[PDB]
Amino acid sequence: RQSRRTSTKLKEGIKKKASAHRKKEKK
Amino acid sequence: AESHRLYVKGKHLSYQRSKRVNNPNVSLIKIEGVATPQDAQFYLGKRIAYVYRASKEVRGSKIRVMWGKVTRTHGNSGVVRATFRNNLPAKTFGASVRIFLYPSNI
Amino acid sequence: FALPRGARTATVSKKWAAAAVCEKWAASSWAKKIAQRERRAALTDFERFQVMVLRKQKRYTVKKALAK
Amino acid sequence: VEPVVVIDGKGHLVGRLASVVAKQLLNGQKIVVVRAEELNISGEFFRNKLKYHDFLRKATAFNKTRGPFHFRAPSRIFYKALRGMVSHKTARGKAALERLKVFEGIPPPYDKKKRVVVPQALRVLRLKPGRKYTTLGKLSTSVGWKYEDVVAKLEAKRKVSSAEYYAKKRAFTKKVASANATAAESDVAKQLAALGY
Amino acid sequence: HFKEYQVIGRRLPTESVPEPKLFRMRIFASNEVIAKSRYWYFLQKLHKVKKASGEIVSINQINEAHPTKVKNFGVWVRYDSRSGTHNMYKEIRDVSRVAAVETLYQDMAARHRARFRSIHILKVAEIEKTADVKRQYVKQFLTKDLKFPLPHRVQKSTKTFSYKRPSTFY
Amino acid sequence: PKWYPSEDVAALKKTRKAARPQKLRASLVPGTVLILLAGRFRGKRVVYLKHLEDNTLLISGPFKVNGVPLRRVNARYVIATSTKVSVEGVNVEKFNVEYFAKEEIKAERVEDQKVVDKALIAEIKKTPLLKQYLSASFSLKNGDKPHMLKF
Amino acid sequence: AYQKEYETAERNIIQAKRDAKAAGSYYVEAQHKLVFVVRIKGINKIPPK
RNA sequence: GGAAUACUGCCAGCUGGGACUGAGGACUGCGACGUAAGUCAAGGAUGCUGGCAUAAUGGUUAUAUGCCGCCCGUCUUGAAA
RNA sequence: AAGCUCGUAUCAGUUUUAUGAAUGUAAGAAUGAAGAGCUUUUAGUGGGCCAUUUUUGGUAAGC
RNA sequence: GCCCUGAAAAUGGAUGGCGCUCAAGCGUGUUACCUAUACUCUACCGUCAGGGUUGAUAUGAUGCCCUGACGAGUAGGCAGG
Incomplete structure (x- = not known):
């Protein structure tokens, strides 16, 4: 079975994936 | 003959707290049958006694007391705020507290 | 009761008076309970005492009738 | 209120029921739950039967014996459930599940004494009419509990020996509801009514 | 909760252009100011304007004719x-x-x-x-003649402990 | 006063609070039936007679009924029940504050009891069950929620 | 003098508002010339400008 | 055709219930009420009453419960280490 | 920190108008501040990491 | 739009737990309530600023006052004990 906790390295390694999607759209 | 009760029987719930930090000066009291803040307003400022036996006799009675006042309401359920002279013990969380009918407004 | 669709206030009143529902309504053990809740709620402390006193008598007559 | 509030699972929702049964001990409230086995839940069966085994597997490594012990018997099933919302471990906790008691069936001395329910938690009254809903009994069994019957059987007994009771009572009343009826309408009475009674 | 607001606006009268076109629209909002704010937003979607370039002439509530x-x-x-x-x-x-x-x-x-x-x-x-x-x-x-029932009626209790075992007829 | 102050205490500022006479809550009209909430006579039904100079109330049971003498009592330690008697037959003006000093019961005090009581009993006898009502003790019964209760 | 001054002020907006609907015209409400402000966010993490 | 009534807003409208507080220490000041004499809720609490000396009360220590509390110092490195 | 002049119209991480190829100069523009400038000297200081906003080079991406 | 599928293993495992299904989930709206060392008010401490005060004050003018604001802090500085 899989988990439903987000580990913080992921929970904040989502923000740092989402930021990369912001700078990608502009260019 | 059966009753000599001139008080409403509430229970001592907690100290007013947070998630983390309790202040023990504000004891939270549930009273019997009271459901709203509206029904509670009546009880505001009546004297409460918490009553208990202790081991040793003091004044010809093993039966000690603390005294205090309902001060304001708490949320909606009618749980009410209450301050005693000496604070109530915490070990008594979920114990009976006799709430009285003086001082009357009625 | 008989009422047309979308009936107005005057028209409602007429038919309400025609069916005379309040008399029908207060005749039920349902409305009688609502009254019996309300009427008890407004007892005086002394008037409540009387009730105890009567219910002392009404019991004696009742427990007489039984065990026969 | 009442010092002991013998509840009764029979159509409640393990959860909810719990919660409240919980709060109530925390606020110093001697409870006692009965007919555990006729407790219910939410969802199909072939679920609770999961949302469980999983639970089962759990258990400890190096030493299986020392670990998450998987109780079968209803009662307990539901216990847990509850010893799970009560900081159990801390005086005030222990001091609770101290105040608790959860029998399957409804053995003496409780047989003989009124029980009750907890609105705010009946299948009938919470589950959108007609929806999958499991019923411990099976769900226990399905995974160990060896008695479903004993209970059952050594049940039917109770029900009997009671209803019987009932009657005798229903018979009794009737008489009253009759005496009062007749010796009702004489003054005294009247009066009362005025006040209401 | 909502109310309906009759609003008119006219892009402030400049020299040689006296009294322009007047744009009437009925806006549902919660208050007069949300209403005004919404009004300009719709103005920017119909044509090229801005909130500072125009003026709210008249904003008046409308009540329902037969409620x-x-x-x-x-x-x-x-x-x-x-x-x-x-x-x-x-x-x-x-x-x-x-x-x-x-x-x-x-x-x-x-x-x-x-x-x-x-x-x-x-x-x-x-x-x-x-x-x-x-x-x-x-x-x-x-x-x-649409006659129907509301079966399975939840009776909301205030008290936690009920002795009757609740039946839901209607 | 003749003795000059041997030590330097500063005198008070000229304090601005005049004592105004106490305004009693609406329900109290002399010759009212009351419950005492605190004291030797907690839980008794008791008749109101006169408001006093020390913001108290003069009340008797009367004594021949429930065993409550002529007593002073405090305004808040009482619930005022709606049942009113006739009180106008009673002479009450004899008793004021000074009537209650002490510097075994005084034979003077018991003489004033019986003058009041017999001039009172008469009026209680008019109403049904009142003589009985007064002799009984007020208490709360299971399901008496006193925010609901009417007195 | 001021009590008369404010009263007559609001009454002659009222009347002037009533006058536009009677005469089919539109009444420009006089531009607001005074604001009150209140700080709503605390002292920290506020940008310099 | 005729009233209302909700809603929004006002009142230097009236009448209650509860908690917390009582700084200061002759008088000066701004006022209000009164025809005046004076009085007052006007530059911060006064009045009455009760409890005691085999006291009242207050404290110390030992635990109990609730809630919170990473091992002190030094030295790096962007802080944790 | 001391000394001297002021105590002001001495200025401001601010807006506006005016005048040129986000951004320069002025105000008999606004708002805010009685805390400014001139001497003389005297400690401590030469760590980066993260985020934001413009870009610049970038291929599976990341950056 | 919600739902199933839209692959990830290997010590038992986590929406934080229990548990939840006309929710205790999702979307939205309305109100009520809970609480910070935040804000308001009062007292107190201290510091800073502005002042009063002598033919001398019913206390050392290096006294005794009145008003107002303010209070994190390492290296470092200044001062009182």
Whole structure:
């Protein structure tokens, strides 16, 4: 079975994936 | 003959707290049958006694007391705020507290 | 009761008076309970005492009738 | 209120029921739950039967014996459930599940004494009419509990020996509801009514 | 909760251009100021203007004509989503223009996740005659003598401990 | 006063609070039936007679009924029940504050009891069950929620 | 003098508002010339400008 | 055709219930009420009453419960280490 | 920190109008501050990491 | 739009737990309530600023006052004990 906790390295390694999607759209 | 009760029987719930930090000066009291803040307003400022036996006799009675006042309401359920002279013990969380009918407004 | 669709206030009143529902309504053990809740709620402390006193008598007559 | 509030699972929702049964001990409230086995839940069966085994597997490594012990018997099933919302471990906790008691069936001395329910938690009254809903009994069994019957059987007994009771009572009343009826309408009475009674 | 606001605006009268065109639109909002704020937003979608370039001439509330009558409401709605925006129409059997647009907004949230910022209400109109009613769940009440029950009635208790074991007839 | 102050205490500022006479809550009209909430006579039904100079109330049971003498009592330690008697037959003006000093019961005090009581009993005898009502003790019974209760 | 001054002020907006609807005209409400402000966010994490 | 009534807003409208507080220490000041004499809720609490000396009360220590509390110092490195 | 002149119209991480190829100069523009400038000297200081906003080079991406 | 599918293993495992299904989930709206060393008010401490005060004050003018604001802090500085 899989988990439903987000580990913080992921929970904040989502923000740092989402930021990369912001700078990608502009260019 | 059966009753000599001139008080409403509430229970001592907690100290007013947070998630983390309790202040023990504000004891939270549930009273019997009271459901709203509206029904509670009546009880505001009546004297409460918490009553208990202790081991040793003091004044010809093993039966000690603390005294205090309902001060304001708490949320909606009618749980009410209450301050005693000496604070109530915490070990008594979920114990009976006799709430009285003086001082009357009625 | 008989009422047309979308009936107005005057028209409602007429038919309400025609069916005379309040008399029908207060005749039920349902409305009688609502009254019996309300009427008890407004007892005086002394008037409540009387009730105890009567219910002392009404019991004696009742427990007489039984065990026969 | 009442010092002991013998509840009764029979159509409640393990959860909810719990919660409240919980709060109530925390606020110093001697409870006692009965007919555990006729407790219910939410969802199909072939679920609770999961949302469980999983639970089962759990258990400890190096030493299986020392670990998450998987109780079968209803009662307990539901216990847990509850010893799970009560900081159990801390005086005030222990001091609770101290105040608790959860029998399957409804053995003496409780047989003989009124029980009750907890609105705010009946299948009938919470589950959108007609929806999958499991019923411990099976769900226990399905995974160990060896008695479903004993209970059952050594049940039917109770029900009997009671209803019987009932009657005798229903018979009794009737008489009253009759005496009062007749010796009702004489003054005294009247009066009362005025006040209401 | 909502109210309907009749608003008119006219892009401040410049030299040689005295008294311009006046743009009337009925805006459902919660207050006069949300209303005004919404008004300019719609102005920027109809043509090229700005909030500072124009003026709110007159903003007045509208009450419902007969709020003891039950009408049926055919509503045109433009709304944005994850994709590009798209026109719509639904029907609402209701009392008041305002309670109609209200109950529509709940439905627009529930089904399509769209919030008040996204939705333009295009036009709300009473439908007078039946058969112009194009939706089934509205036509469903437009039958002669509709007598039905509400089975399985939840009686909300205040007290936690009930002794009766609650039965739900009605 | 003749003795000059041997030590330097500063005198008070000229304090601005005049004592105004106490305004009693609406329900109290002399010759009212009361419950005492605190004291030796907690839980008794008791008749109101006169408001006093020390913001108290002069009350008797009367004594021949429930065993409550002529007593002073405090305004808040009482619930005022709606049942009113006739009180106008009673002479009450004899008793004021000074009537209650002490510097085994005084034979003077018991003489004033019986003058009041017999001039009172008469009026209680008019109403049904009142003589009985007064002799009984007030208490709360299970399900008496006193925010609901009417007195 | 001021009590008369404010009263007559609001009454002659009222009347002037009533005058536009009677005469079919439109009444421009006099531009707001005074604001009250209140700080709503705390002292930290506020940008310099 | 005729009233209302909700809603919004006002009152230097009236009448209650509860908690917390009582700084200061002759008088000066701004006032209000009164025809005046004076009085007052006007530059911060006064009045009455009760409890005691085999006291009242207050404290110390030992635990109990509730809630919170990473091992002190030094030295790096962007802080944890 | 001391000394001298002031105590002001001495200025401001601010807006506006005016005048040129986000951004320069002025105000008999606004708002805010009685805390400014001139001497003389005297400690401590030469760590980066993260985020934001413009870009610049970038291929599976990341950056 | 919600739902299932839209692959990830290997010590038992986590929406934080229990548990939840006309929710205790999703979307939205309305109100009520809970609480920070935040804000308001009062007292107190201290510091800073502005002042009063002598033919001398019912206390050391290096006294005794009145008003107002303010109070994190390492290296470092200044001062009182």
